[PDB]
mmCIF file of C-alpha atoms and ligand atoms in Angstrom:
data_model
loop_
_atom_site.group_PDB
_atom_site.id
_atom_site.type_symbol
_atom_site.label_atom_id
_atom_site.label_comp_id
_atom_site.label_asym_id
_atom_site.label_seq_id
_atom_site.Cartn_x
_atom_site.Cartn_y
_atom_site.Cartn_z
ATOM 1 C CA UNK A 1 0.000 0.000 0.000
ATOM 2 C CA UNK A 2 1.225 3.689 -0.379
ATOM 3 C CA UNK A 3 0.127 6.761 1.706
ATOM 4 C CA UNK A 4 0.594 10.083 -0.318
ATOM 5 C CA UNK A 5 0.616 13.633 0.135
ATOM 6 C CA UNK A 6 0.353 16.351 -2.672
ATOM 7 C CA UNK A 7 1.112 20.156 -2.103
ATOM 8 C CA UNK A 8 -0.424 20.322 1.343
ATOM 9 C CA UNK A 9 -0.871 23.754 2.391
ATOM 10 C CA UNK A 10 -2.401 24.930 5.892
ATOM 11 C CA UNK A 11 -2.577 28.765 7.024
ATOM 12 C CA UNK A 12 -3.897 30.102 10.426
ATOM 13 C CA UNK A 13 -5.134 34.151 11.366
ATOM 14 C CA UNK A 14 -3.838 34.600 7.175
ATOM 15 C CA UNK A 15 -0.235 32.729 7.882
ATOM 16 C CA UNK A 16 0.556 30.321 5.953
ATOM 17 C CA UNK A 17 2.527 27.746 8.599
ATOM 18 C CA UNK A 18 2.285 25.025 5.935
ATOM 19 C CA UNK A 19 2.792 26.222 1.685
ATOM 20 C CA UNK A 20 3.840 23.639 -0.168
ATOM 21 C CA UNK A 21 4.678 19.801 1.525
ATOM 22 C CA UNK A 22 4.403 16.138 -0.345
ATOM 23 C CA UNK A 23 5.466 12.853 1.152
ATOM 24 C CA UNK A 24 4.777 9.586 0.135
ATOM 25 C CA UNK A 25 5.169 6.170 2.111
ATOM 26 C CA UNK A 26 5.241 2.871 1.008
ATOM 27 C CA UNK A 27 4.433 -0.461 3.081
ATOM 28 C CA UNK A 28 7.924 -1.799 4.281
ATOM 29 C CA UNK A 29 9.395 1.515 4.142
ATOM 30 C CA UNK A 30 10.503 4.194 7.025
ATOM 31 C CA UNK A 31 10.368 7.302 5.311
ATOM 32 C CA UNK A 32 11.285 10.924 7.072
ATOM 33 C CA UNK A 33 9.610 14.482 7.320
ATOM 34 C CA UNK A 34 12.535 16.432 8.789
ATOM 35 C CA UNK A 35 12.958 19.589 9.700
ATOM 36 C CA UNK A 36 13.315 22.613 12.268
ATOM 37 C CA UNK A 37 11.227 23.393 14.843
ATOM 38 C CA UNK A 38 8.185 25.113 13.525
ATOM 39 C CA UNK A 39 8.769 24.110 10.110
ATOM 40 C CA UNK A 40 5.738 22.690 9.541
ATOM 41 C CA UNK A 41 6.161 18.812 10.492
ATOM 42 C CA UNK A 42 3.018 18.815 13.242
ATOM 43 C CA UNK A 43 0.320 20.924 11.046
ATOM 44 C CA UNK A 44 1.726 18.323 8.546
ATOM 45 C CA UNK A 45 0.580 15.427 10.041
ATOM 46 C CA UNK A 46 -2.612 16.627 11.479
ATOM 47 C CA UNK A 47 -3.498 17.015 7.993
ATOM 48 C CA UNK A 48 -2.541 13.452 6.980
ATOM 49 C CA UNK A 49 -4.311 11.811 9.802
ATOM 50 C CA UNK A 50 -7.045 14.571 9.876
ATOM 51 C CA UNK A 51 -7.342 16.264 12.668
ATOM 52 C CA UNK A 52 -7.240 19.721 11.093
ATOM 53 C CA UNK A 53 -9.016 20.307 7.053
ATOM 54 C CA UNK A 54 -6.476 20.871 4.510
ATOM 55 C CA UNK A 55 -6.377 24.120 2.821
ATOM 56 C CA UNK A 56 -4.950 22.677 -0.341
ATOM 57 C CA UNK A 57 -3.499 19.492 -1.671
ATOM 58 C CA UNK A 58 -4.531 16.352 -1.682
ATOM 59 C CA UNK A 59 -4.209 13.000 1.207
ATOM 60 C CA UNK A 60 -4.501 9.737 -1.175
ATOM 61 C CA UNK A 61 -4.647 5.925 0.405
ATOM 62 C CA UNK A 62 -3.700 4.100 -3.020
ATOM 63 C CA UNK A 63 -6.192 4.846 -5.449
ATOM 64 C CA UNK A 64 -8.635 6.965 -2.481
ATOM 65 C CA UNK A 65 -8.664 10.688 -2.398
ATOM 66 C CA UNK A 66 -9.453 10.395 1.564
ATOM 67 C CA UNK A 67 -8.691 14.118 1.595
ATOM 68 C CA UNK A 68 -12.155 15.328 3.110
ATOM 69 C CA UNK A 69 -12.766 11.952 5.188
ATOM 70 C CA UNK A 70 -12.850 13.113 9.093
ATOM 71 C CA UNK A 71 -10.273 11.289 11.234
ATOM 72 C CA UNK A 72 -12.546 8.287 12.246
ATOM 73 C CA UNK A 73 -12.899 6.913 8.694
ATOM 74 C CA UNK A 74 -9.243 7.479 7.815
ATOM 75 C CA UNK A 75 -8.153 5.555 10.977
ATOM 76 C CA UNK A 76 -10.091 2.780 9.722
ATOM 77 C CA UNK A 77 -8.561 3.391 5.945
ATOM 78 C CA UNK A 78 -5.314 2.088 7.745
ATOM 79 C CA UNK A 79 -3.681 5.361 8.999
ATOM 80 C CA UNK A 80 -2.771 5.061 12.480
ATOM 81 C CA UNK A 81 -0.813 8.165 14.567
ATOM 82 C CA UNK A 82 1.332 8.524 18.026
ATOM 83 C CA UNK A 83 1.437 12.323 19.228
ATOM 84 C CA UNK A 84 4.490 13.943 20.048
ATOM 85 C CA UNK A 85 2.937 14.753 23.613
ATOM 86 C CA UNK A 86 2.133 12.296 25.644
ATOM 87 C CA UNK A 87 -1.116 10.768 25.040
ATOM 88 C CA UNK A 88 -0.825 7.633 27.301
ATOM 89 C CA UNK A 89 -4.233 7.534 29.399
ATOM 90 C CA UNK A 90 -2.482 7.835 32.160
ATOM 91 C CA UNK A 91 -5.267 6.783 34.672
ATOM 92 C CA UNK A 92 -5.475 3.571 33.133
ATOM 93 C CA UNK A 93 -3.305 0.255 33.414
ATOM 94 C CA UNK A 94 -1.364 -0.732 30.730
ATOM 95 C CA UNK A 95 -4.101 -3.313 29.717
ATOM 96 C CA UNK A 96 -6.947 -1.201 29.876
ATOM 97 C CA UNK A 97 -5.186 1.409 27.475
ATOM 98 C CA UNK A 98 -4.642 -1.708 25.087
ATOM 99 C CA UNK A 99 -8.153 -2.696 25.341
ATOM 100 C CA UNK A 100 -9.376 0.857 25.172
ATOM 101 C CA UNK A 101 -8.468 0.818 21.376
ATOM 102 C CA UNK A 102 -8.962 -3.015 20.744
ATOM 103 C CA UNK A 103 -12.274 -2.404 21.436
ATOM 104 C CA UNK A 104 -12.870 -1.059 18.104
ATOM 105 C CA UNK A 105 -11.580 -4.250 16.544
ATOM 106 C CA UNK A 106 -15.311 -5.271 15.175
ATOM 107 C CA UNK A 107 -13.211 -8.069 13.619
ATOM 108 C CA UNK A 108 -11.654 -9.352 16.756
ATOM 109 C CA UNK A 109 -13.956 -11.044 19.293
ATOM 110 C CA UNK A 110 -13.601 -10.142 22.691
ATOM 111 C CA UNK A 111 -11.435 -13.624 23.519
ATOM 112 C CA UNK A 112 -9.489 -12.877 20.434
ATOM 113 C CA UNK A 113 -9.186 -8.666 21.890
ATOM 114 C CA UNK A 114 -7.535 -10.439 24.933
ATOM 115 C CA UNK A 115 -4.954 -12.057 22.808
ATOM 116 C CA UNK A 116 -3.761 -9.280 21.215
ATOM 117 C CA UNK A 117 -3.283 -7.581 24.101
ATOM 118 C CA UNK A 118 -1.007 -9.981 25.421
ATOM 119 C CA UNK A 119 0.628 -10.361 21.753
ATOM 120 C CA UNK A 120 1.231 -6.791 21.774
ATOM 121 C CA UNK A 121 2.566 -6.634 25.502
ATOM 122 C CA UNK A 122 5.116 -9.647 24.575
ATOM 123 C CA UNK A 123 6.166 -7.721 21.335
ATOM 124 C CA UNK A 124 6.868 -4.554 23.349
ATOM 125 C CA UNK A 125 8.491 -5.922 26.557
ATOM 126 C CA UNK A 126 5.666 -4.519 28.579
ATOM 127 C CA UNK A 127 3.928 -7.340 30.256
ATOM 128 C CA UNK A 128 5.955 -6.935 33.808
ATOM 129 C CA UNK A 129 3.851 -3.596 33.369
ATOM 130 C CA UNK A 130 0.429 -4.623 32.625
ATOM 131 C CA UNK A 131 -1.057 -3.673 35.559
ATOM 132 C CA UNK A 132 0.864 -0.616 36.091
ATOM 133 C CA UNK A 133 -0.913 2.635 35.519
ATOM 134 C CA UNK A 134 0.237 4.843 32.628
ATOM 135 C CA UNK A 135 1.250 7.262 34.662
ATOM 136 C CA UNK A 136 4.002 5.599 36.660
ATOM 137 C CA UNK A 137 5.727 5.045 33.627
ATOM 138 C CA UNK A 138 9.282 6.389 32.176
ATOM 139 C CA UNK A 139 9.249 8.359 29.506
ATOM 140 C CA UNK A 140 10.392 5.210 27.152
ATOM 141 C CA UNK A 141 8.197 2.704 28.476
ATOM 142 C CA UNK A 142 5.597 4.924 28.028
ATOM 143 C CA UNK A 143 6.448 5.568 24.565
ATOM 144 C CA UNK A 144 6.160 1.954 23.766
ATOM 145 C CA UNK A 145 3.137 1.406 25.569
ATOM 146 C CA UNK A 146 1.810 4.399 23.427
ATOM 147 C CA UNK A 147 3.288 2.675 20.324
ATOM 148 C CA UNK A 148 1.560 -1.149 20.835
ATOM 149 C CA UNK A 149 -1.816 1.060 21.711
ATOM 150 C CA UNK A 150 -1.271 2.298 18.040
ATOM 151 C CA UNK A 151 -0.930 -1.367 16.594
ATOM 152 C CA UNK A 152 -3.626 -2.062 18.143
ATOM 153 C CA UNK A 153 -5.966 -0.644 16.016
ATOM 154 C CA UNK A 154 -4.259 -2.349 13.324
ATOM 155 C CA UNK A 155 -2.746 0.330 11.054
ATOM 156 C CA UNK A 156 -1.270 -0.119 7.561
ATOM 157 C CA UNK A 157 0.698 2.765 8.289
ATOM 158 C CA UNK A 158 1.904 4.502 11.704
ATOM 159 C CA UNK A 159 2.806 8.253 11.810
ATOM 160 C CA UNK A 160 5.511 9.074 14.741
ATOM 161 C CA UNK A 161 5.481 12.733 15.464
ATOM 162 C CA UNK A 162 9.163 12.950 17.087
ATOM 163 C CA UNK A 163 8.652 9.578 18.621
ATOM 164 C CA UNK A 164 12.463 9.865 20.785
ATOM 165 C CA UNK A 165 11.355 13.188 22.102
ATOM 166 C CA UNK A 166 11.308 12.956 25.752
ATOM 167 C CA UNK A 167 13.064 9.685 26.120
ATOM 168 C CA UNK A 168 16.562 8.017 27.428
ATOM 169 C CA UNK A 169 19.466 7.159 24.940
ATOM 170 C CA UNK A 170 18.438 3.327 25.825
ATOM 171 C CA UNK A 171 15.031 3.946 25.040
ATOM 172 C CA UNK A 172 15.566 5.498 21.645
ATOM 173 C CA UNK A 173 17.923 2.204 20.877
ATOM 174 C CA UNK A 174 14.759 0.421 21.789
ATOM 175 C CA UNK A 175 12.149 2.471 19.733
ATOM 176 C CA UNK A 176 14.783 2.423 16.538
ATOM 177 C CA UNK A 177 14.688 -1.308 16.866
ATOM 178 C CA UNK A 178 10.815 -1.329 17.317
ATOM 179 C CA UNK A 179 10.360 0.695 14.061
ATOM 180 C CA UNK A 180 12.546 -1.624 11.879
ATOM 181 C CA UNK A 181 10.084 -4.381 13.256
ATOM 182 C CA UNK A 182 7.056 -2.513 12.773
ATOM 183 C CA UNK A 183 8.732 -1.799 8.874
ATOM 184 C CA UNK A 184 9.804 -5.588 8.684
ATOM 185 C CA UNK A 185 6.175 -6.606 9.443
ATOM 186 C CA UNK A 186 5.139 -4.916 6.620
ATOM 187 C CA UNK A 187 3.615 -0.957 7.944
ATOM 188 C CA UNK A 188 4.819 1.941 6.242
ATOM 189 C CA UNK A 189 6.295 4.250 8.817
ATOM 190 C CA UNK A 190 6.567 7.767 8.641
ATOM 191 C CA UNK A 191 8.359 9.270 11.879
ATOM 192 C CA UNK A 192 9.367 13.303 11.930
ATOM 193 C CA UNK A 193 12.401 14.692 13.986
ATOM 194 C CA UNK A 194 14.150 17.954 13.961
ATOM 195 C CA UNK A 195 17.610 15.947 14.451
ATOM 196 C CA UNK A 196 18.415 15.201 10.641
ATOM 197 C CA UNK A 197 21.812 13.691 11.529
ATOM 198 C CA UNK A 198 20.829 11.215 13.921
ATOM 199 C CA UNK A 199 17.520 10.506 11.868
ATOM 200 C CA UNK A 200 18.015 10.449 8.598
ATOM 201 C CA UNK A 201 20.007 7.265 8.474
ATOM 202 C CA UNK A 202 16.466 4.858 9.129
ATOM 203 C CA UNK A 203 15.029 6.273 6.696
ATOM 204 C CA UNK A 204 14.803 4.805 3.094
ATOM 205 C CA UNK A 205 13.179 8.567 1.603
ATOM 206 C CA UNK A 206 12.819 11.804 3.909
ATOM 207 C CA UNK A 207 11.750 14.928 2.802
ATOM 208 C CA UNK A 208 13.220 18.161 4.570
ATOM 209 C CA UNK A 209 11.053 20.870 4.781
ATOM 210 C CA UNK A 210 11.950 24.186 6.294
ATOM 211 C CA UNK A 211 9.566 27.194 6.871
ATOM 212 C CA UNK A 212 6.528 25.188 5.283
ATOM 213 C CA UNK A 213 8.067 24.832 2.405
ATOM 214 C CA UNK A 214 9.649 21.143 1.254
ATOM 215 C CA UNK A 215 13.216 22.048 0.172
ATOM 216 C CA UNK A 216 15.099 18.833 -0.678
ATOM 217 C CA UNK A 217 14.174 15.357 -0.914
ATOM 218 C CA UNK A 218 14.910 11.716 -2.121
ATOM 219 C CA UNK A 219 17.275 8.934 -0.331
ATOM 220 C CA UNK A 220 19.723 10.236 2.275
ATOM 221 C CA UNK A 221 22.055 10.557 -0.376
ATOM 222 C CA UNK A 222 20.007 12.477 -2.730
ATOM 223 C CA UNK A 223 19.451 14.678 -0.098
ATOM 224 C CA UNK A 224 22.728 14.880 1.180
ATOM 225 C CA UNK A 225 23.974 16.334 -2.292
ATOM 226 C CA UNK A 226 21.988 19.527 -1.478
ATOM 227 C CA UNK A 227 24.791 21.895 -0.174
ATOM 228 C CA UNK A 228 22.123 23.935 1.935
ATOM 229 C CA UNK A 229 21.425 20.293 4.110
ATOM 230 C CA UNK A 230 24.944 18.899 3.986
ATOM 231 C CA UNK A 231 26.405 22.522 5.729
ATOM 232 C CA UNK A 232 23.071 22.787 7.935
ATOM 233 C CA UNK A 233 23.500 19.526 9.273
HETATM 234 C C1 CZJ B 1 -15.625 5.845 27.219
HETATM 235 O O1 CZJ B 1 -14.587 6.555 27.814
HETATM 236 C C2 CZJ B 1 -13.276 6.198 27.379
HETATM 237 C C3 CZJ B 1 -12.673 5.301 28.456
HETATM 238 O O2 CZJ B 1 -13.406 4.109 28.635
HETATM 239 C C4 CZJ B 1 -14.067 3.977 29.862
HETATM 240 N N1 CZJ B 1 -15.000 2.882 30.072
HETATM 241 O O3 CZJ B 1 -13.885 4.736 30.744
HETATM 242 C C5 CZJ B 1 -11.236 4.996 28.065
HETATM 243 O O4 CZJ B 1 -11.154 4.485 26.785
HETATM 244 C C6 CZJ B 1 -10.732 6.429 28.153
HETATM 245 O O5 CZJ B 1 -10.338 6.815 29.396
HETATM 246 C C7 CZJ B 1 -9.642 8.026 29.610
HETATM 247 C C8 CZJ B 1 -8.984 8.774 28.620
HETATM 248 C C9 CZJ B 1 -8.315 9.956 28.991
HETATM 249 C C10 CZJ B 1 -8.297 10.376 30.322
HETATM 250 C C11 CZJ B 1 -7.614 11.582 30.686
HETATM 251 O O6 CZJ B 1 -6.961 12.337 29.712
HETATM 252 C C12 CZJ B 1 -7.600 11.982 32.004
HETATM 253 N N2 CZJ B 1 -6.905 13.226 32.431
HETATM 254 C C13 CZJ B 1 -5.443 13.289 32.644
HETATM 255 O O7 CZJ B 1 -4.773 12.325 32.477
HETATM 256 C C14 CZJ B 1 -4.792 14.644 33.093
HETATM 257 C C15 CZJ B 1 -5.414 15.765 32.318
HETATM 258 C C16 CZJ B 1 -4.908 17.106 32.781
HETATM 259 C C17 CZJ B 1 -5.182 17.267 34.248
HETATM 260 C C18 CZJ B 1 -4.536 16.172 35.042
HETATM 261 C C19 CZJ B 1 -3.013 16.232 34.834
HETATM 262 C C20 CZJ B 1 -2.711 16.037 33.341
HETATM 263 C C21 CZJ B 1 -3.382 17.174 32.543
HETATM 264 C C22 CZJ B 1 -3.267 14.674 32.868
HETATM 265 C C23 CZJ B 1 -5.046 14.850 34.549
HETATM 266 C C24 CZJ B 1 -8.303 11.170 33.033
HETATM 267 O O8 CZJ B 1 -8.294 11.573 34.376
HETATM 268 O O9 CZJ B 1 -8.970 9.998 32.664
HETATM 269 C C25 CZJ B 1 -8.954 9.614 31.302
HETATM 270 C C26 CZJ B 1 -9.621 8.450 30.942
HETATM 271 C C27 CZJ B 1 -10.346 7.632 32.007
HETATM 272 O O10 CZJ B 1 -11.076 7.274 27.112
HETATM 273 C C28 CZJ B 1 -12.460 7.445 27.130
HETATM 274 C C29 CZJ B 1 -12.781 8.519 28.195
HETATM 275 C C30 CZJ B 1 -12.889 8.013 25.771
HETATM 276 N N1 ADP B 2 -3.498 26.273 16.065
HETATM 277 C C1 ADP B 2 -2.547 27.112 15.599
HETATM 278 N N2 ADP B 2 -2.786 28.427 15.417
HETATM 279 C C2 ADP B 2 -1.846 29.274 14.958
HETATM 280 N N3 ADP B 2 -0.599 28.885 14.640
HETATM 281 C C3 ADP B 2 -0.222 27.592 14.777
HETATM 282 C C4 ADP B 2 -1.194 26.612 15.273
HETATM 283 N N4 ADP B 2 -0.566 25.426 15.304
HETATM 284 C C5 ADP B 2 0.705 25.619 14.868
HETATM 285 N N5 ADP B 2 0.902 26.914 14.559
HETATM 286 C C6 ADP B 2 2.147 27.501 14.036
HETATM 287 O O1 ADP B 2 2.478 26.868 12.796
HETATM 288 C C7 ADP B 2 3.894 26.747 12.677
HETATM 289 C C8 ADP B 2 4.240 25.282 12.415
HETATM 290 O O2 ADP B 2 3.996 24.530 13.598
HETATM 291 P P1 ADP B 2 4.217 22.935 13.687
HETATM 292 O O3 ADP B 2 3.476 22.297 12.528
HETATM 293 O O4 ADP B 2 3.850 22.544 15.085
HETATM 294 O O5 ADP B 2 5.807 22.847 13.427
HETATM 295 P P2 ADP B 2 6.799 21.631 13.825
HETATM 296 O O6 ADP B 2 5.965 20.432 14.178
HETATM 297 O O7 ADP B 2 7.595 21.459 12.558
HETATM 298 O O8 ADP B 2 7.597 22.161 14.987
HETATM 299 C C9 ADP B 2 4.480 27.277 13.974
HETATM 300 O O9 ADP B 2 4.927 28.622 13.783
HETATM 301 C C10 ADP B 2 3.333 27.282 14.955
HETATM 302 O O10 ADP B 2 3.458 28.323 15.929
HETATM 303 MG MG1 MG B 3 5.832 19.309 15.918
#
């Protein structure tokens, strides 16, 4: 499968914070949106996974224009999405936020809902935590928690906003190796990061934008031809 975006533009009060961005992603691939901070890369995705309308462009699913579908229908298109924040429900055991999102797995039954959960919890090295309550957990087991929660809606493809913000040196290790498996299992993963450098080398394709605009693009060593990116970074 292959998640596109065309010429996305997004403007707030008359500013355009978002002019001119494309990306595509293809299942089995990590591909990058990188860039500086307020470049772009959040408005970005909200307009990929819908949570703000799209001034112009165009959000395709293979051969769907999904570009006016509201965030519900999209999710169930295959487009799944992890905040930057943290959006852990932090009230809530490990399980329960698992089940909270299996339980819109209509083609799960509830026996087969428990399952995944503990399929998921295996995968992620998070069973020791399954009764644990969101909020008593570090920053990187929280981030996989938040990361299995994703799966378990079942995504085609899984949008990281800055997924290693906010956790250890260990942890990012961990959620590198997590996104080659989630790649290997056949998702298409598109994470963003401000941190070209240390970022760019996962990814198959990134595109670099920079003040809403998408400035270079391609492999890493495509982009790495463009003198503006190689001094920059
Ligand atoms: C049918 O409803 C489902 C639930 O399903 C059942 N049957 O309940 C379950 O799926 C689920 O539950 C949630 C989800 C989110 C929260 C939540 O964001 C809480 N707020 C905090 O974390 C904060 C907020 C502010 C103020 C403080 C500090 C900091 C900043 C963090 C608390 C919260 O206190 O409880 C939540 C619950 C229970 O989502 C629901 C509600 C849609
Ligand atoms: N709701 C909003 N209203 C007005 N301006 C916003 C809003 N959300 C984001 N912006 C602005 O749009 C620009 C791009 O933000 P963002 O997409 O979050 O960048 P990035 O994720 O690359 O850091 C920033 O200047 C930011 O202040
Ligand atoms: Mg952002």
């Amino acid at each position: 499968a292959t998640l596109t975006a065309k010429n996305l533009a997004k403007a707030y009060k008359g500013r355009r914070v978002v002019e001119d961005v494309s990306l595509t992603v293809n299942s089995g691939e990590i591909v990058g949106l990188l860039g500086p901070n307020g470049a772009g890369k959040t408005t970005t995705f909200y307009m990929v996974v819908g949570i703000v309308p799209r001034d112009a462009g165009n959000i395709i699913i293979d051969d769907d224009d999904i570009s006016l579908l509201p965030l519900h229908a999209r999710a169930r298109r295959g487009i799944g999405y992890l905040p930057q924040e943290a959006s852990i429900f932090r009230r809530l055991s490990v399980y329960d936020n698992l089940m909270a999102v299996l339980q819109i797995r209509d083609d799960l039954s509830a026996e087969q809902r428990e399952d995944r959960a503990n399929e998921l919890m295996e995968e992620f090295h998070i069973e020791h935590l399954r009764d644990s309550m969101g909020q008593s957990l570090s920053g990187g087991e929280r981030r996989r928690v938040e990361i299995a929660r994703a799966l378990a809606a079942n995504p085609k493809f899984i949008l990281l906003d800055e997924p290693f913000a906010g956790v250890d040196p260990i942890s990012v290790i961990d959620i590198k190796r997590i996104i080659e498996h989630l790649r290997d299992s056949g998702l298409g993963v598109l994470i963003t990061d401000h941190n070209v450098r240390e970022t760019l080398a996962v990814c198959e394709r990134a595109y670099i934008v920079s003040q809403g605009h998408l400035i270079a693009h391609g492999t890493p060593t495509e982009i790495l031809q463009d003198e503006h990116v190689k001094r920059v970074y």
